[PDB]
Design an enzyme around this catalytic site. Structure first.
Site, short mmCIF file in Angstrom:
data_model
loop_
_atom_site.label_atom_id
_atom_site.label_comp_id
_atom_site.label_asym_id
_atom_site.label_seq_id
_atom_site.Cartn_x
_atom_site.Cartn_y
_atom_site.Cartn_z
N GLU A 1 -9.86 -5.04 -3.30
CA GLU A 1 -9.01 -3.96 -2.80
C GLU A 1 -9.81 -2.82 -2.20
O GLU A 1 -9.28 -2.09 -1.36
CB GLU A 1 -8.13 -3.39 -3.94
CG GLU A 1 -7.08 -4.36 -4.52
CD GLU A 1 -5.81 -4.43 -3.65
OE1 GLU A 1 -5.89 -4.08 -2.44
OE2 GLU A 1 -4.74 -4.84 -4.16
N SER B 1 0.86 -1.20 0.00
CA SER B 1 0.00 0.00 0.00
C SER B 1 0.89 1.24 0.00
O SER B 1 1.68 1.38 -0.95
CB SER B 1 -1.00 -0.11 1.16
OG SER B 1 -1.97 0.93 1.10
N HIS C 1 -7.52 -5.79 0.86
CA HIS C 1 -6.28 -5.05 0.98
C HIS C 1 -5.45 -5.49 2.18
O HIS C 1 -5.90 -5.39 3.32
CB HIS C 1 -6.65 -3.59 1.13
CG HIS C 1 -5.53 -2.65 0.89
ND1 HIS C 1 -4.90 -2.54 -0.33
CD2 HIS C 1 -4.93 -1.75 1.71
CE1 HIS C 1 -3.97 -1.60 -0.26
NE2 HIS C 1 -3.97 -1.11 0.96
#
Ligand SMILES: *[C@@H]1O[C@H](CO)[C@@H](O)[C@H](O)[C@H]1NC(C)=O
Ligand SMILES: *[C@@H]1O[C@H](CO)[C@@H](O)[C@H](O)[C@H]1NC(C)=O
Ligand SMILES: *[C@@H]1O[C@H](CO)[C@@H](O)[C@H](O)[C@H]1NC(C)=O
Ligand SMILES: [Cl-]
Lengths: 537, 537
Positions: B324, B198, B438
């Site tokens: 995500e 990320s 995520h």
């Protein structure tokens, strides 16, 4: 008693026993008249019924074809000549054909064929439509009819002497002949299934709407055609202009204020001169003379009938082929898609084609079409850009309109059966990249593979038997499926308003899917209209 | 001689030998200082290097975490607490951790982790990042670093005392420390693979661009982050406003003309007061203090570097997870996506969400998004409309930016490996509908399933071994694949500029695809930008 002599409501007629290509025998009546010849003062006008005759009329010769242009673009190419008229051209063309099995039935189902040809071409007498295989293999009465095409069938000026839809009133008259007479040939007049392909399918769908045809048949099969197709109807105002342009083009008066002068001159012209001068500046899948909303055959647009539930409550079987667009592009973009093996399209050519094939939409609309019809795995692939051309034409003018019609029928509670036809014949004469084009299923529907002088494989013969059995089960019962579920005959599930299942028709397949092509169809029916509205200030 | 005492370039340090949950042992040095504490006058400014010390510094305790807000939205829910700082919060947080295998190698490859957390949160000390399994199973030096987050890490006013990107300069200094010292711990300083997830992946990618970092590492792994993500950078003009808004919010002077007064007051506020007042009115995946183009760490936007080929030429391994978007929606639309089992979204709720999640685009753009993200098989299905919310947020903010970065690296001749991570842990604590969210791959990358006291299945333990092996093969050789092709280790093909293959990472799979999600990524990257342009009068 002579079982081939039949007393119709206008006179006696004599048929003839002949062989199907398979060897089975059928009785046949060719060229039965159902209207006065639509000649002289009667041109452009609705049919009058046939005058009574004395004696026995020998109805044994395939009838005249209605006047229409002949396709010579590819010379003696068999893929094109099979659609050209195979009997003399004449305005004296309003005839019906009946083909009955042997031994003669008492109350058989009746399959009534309405030929296609984009409303400017076609004839019931084509060899590909030969009725003997279907009647003899499936035990149905097969009926076919002529109807006027092109400007002779569909000239409209909004006056009584050019009221429009003459060709559709021809079909309606023939439907009435069948209900008045078909029981004398062994058919049940309460068991008439209309079936047709392309403009014949549009025609069938219009009989599902018209109040004049509502009680003249039982159910319908619609192969690759639907009345919401953008080529299927023209507005009254635009039809009037097109008629006046035709009058100018042949040297006739053409003043919007004196329509009598224009019709009268048109009635004096040679019929071949008329049909050979119809073709102005038109886009792909736009044909000059087609049905209108006239006030008597239809009094509202098909989309308004569908929205309101004003259509016949009955079963329908309908479907599409995988490459519906190519046939029309092959004749329209003759430099781009030459009729050769190994044709491909460059990205820059595809981008130019999108503008030519969608000439009426603005810049934002073209980009949407480009985005919708690009292979994003490999945007410049020259096969993908050629295939995109078929799919965008095929989706917009064919597949998505069949989907729309089948949807409304299903939402209104009727049993619907939907197919996607995917078989390419081993002997197809068109280039390999054309895939499964518009019309390919017709040979299999009429049982041509069973003709031992032709080149069809044994697998293709079984396939044609499967398809004739589905089609005739549907005519006989409203359901294409048999009673004893077979290994050779997969299950064909209903196309429900929310499931939208379809059966893929092909050699080694029983695949059931959804749609087909629900996403591309939503693009044309839902996304693109709201984007055009948003960007048209 | 004590092999747990190491003479760094600033002083001696003492480590400690510990057990892996694997049963093998590793040596560990926690809390090595690499900068002066960035406190008092040094707040917001780039780090100075650490002053030399006499004696032996005991480096055996996980270091302080940098000041940041703590997430309490779901209380003590394990799915949330695993991301909260697990060591005391302090501005004195600039430390590195080194973990070496036993027996100690001579020139081992070095895997250097940069934590994510959207540039306002995160810490190298999280249990989920624990280095021992990866180091001992794969025989690599594992290193991690702290860097400042939030306004303390990324305040920008365009003045020397608020120059921006302090957190990235922190990472750069730590990288320097590694190249100056890691050979004393058994690592080859010419074999540093950066990896992060990320905002950690964004950070890694920015080291692939910066001229200050170019020679400080060898290759890069980027999990679910790319520098083209719309949240990854903020303009200098908007950064200045956000900083001034922070000054206002905490009672400081905030006049665009007197920036010294604003910086000097901010340097006097409590650090927790600063980070707790940053959250103005922002959209989903908009974080207030993030990297800028400053002139020294970066002097052009990432997209300009990518277009011109100004980026480090090396191999990269990169990828995305299948869901995500949900993580961010769960925290942004807290009334719609409640953290309960069996959530669904109505069609009318979906249409409202599209406006809330894409608040800057006009009406035409919203329709395109609606059309692109509708299940046209079943438009009103409430699972489909929930999943669509994940896909539109995940595609736009994550997946499509990873694709773009891997694409440009491949076009310039570098070896790229692309994954789609699809495994959901059996013990996942989030609702079943959240899928593979995520950050889910991090547990498997760091070998957490090898801790038998957690609940992981035997298959998931194998999967984690496979993934650590892929990751460390990549660090060691530039290719994740082994030499002898295994049944347990499928082939992972290169992501070429025109093939764009990816390997799906999951339990019972070796599927190779293209993209992933090439069509949706083309919608965001090509179609929607040109439609916004056309409709912006
Ligand atoms: C019809 O067929 C019969 C023989 O079957 C023949 O005698 C007759 O002349 C034919 N023509 C007409 C017009 O009836
Ligand atoms: C560091 O560790 C050594 C030995 O383990 C111990 O004797 C010493 O007191 C420690 N130093 C500090 C400052 O705690
Ligand atoms: C793995 O995939 C095959 C493919 O059908 C399947 O037969 C097998 O049971 C699967 N194993 C699992 C899901 O554990
Ligand atoms: Cl460079």
């Amino acid at each position: 008693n002579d079982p081939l002599v039949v007393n119709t409501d206008k006179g006696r007629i004599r048929g003839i026993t002949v062989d199907a290509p398979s060897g089975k025998k059928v009785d046949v009546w060719l060229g039965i008249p159902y209207a006065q010849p639509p000649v002289g003062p009667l041109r452009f006008r609705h049919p009058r019924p046939a005058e009574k005759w004395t004696g026995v009329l020998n109805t044994t010769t395939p009838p005249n074809s209605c006047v229409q242009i002949v396709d010579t673009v590819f010379g003696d190419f068999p893929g094109a000549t099979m659609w050209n008229p195979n009997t003399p051209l004449s305005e004296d063309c309003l005839y019906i054909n009946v083909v009955a099995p042997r031994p003669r039935p008492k109350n058989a189902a009746v399959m009534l064929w309405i030929f296609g040809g984009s409303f400017y071409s076609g004839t019931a007498t084509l060899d590909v439509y030969d009725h003997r295989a279907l009647a003899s293999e499936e035990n149905v009465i097969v009926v076919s009819l002529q109807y006027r095409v092109a400007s002779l069938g569909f000239l409209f000026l909004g006056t009584p002497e050019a009221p429009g839809n003459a060709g559709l009133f021809d079909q309606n008259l023939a439907l009435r002949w069948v209900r008045d007479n078909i029981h004398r040939f062994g058919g049940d007049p309460s068991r008439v299934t209309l079936f047709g392909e392309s403009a014949g399918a549009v025609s069938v769908s219009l009989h599902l709407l018209s109040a004049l045809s509502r009680d003249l048949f039982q159910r319908a099969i619609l192969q690759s055609g639907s009345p919401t197709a953008p080529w299927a109807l023209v507005s009254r105002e635009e039809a009037t202009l097109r008629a006046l342009r035709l009058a100018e083009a042949v040297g006739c008066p053409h003043e919007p204020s004196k329509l009598s002068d224009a019709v009268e001159c048109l009635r004096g012209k040679d019929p071949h001169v008329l049909v050979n001068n119809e073709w102005g500046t038109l886009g792909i899948c736009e044909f000059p003379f087609v049905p209108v909303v006239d006030g008597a055959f239809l009094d509202e647009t098909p989309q308004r009938s569908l929205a309101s539930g004003r259509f016949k409550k009955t079963e329908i079987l309908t479907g599409s082929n995988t490459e519906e667009g190519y046939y029309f592009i092959i004749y329209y973009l003759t430099e781009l898609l030459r009729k050769e093996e190994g044709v491909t399209v460059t990205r820059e050519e595809f981008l130019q084609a999108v503008r030519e094939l969608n000439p009426y939409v603005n810049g934002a609309a073209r980009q949407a079409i480009v985005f919708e019809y690009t292979d994003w795995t490999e945007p410049d692939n020259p096969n993908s850009n050629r295939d995109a051309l078929d799919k965008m034409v095929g989706d917009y003018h064919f597949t998505c309109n069949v989907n729309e019609f089948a949807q409304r029928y299903a939402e209104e509670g009727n049993n619907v059966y939907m197919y996607l036809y995917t078989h390419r014949s081993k002997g197809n004469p068109w280039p390999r990249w054309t895939g499964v084009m518009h019309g390919d299923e017709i040979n299999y529907v009429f049982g041509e593979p069973l003709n031992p002088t032709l080149g069809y494989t044994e697998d293709e013969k079984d396939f044609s038997r499967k398809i004739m059995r589905y089609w005739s089960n549907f005519a006989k019962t409203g359901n294409p499926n048999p009673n004893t579920a077979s290994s050779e005959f997969p299950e064909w599930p209903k196309h429900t308003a929310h499931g939208r299942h379809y059966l893929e028709l092909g050699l080694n397949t029983s695949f059931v899917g959804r749609g087909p092509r629900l996403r591309q169809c939503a693009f044309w029916k839902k996304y693109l209209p709201q984007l055009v509205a948003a960007t048209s200030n």
